Ligand binder design. Structure first.
Ligand SMILES: Oc1ccc(/C=C/c2cccc3ccccc23)cc1O
Ligand SMILES: Oc1ccc(/C=C/c2cccc3ccccc23)cc1O
Ligand code: NA
Ligand code: NA
Lengths: 115, 114, 115, 114
């Protein structure tokens, strides 16, 4: 129900081994750790959560872009890329959070489908 | 030293009257309010800070994209768009944070000049 | 060896039924029709060409964005989105041409992999 | 009436000294040269045309991205970036064509104002 896809606009490749942290806003308005992982050789991160665990809420997907660029010898502009959204407020959906990275720029889009 | 520019990819226009909040990371790792305003008719927010106040540090620019889309009657995906970066005195000294908005997507770039 | 993926930044969905025309620059410097098709329900267009047919050259991928938006009741800015690139000049590669569409904006990236 | 702005997403800077060619579609469906220049130190190209010359029609803005990346020693994907659009007198009358460049990607938007 939640997938993250990361691409590299400099190399024209998947962004491999990118750390991703997901948080859910708690009743006390704090960010609770929800799930985390690293992108694969295809730039994708699957298996973060289940339909049962991925309840209504406000979620934050943090993509560790700075560590990614530093590993390639680029001192980038951003600390990270954060994507913050309400999920599953009209019932369960499938979410793909996609990011396209450059050293001084990033772009993000969502693909939301109803199973 | 710090300018924010916001554009609308649906209407092909500046994003006018968008709330923007700037925070600086404190020593306790919390976000301290730093500056804020609403974008002009040109989609720009000037006069956020001075060279004296804008010291090295980690800054967050929060753009209230959700209110912007709701005001146009368009269902948006994001709660807001956040841009988090380090200001470095070794780098050039004027920072433009630009954002291009769509209902389910945003893009941001930095233009850093002397 | 050539795949096209198109996403809609307004609806947060694949861009379905988008016409795509591919051209190859001929020896006389004209654009020769090479392949064409329409994006699927996933926003993807597969099966445009084969490793054998997809020789070295300069290729143009034309995505008919204007017809797509008009069908959704939006008068868009661009006539089309064109992606022009040299392919296979260092031997065969796999190319994904991806586009993210808004009425007054588009973004494109390439993912190039070596089988 | 027509301005082109080009930004570099790798260096976080204006894209300086980029060749830009503008064409207008002729009645025989060929691209007629209309205007051209090189981007300034601000990444901008002004003075391409006048209100009198910039009549309704189909225009193409060609940005020589390949030469730009080659000059930086960076291997690029695209031969160039082309932006093709209709100028419409019913719409607002100033057109900014903006492009954000990376070696394997570009993004473009239109800012159309009165
Ligand atoms: O399965 C896929 C899912 C999402 C993307 C995204 C592609 C993209 C293209 C062009 C611009 C972008 C801007 C931001 C995020 C993604 C993009 C690509 C895939 O192959
Ligand atoms: O004075 C200006 C300063 C910044 C921008 C930005 C334009 C842009 C274009 C194309 C893609 C983008 C993606 C993210 C952010 C900005 C963009 C435009 C201006 O006229
Ligand atoms: Na609900
Ligand atoms: Na060769």
């Amino acid at each position: 129900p939640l997938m993250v896809k990361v691409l590299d606009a400099v190399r024209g490749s998947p962004a491999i081994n990118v750390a991703v942290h997901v948080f859910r806003k708690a009743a006390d308005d704090t960010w609770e750790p929800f799930a985390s992982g690293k992108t694969s050789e295809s730039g994708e991160l699957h298996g973060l959560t289940t339909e049962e665990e991925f309840v209504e809420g406000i979620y934050k997907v943090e993509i560790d872009t700075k560590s990614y660029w530093k590993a390639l010898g680029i001192s980038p502009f951003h600390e990270h890329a954060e994507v913050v959204f309400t999920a599953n407020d009209s019932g369960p959906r499938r979410y793909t959070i996609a990011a396209l990275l450059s050293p001084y720029s990033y772009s993000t889009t969502a693909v939301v489908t109803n199973p």
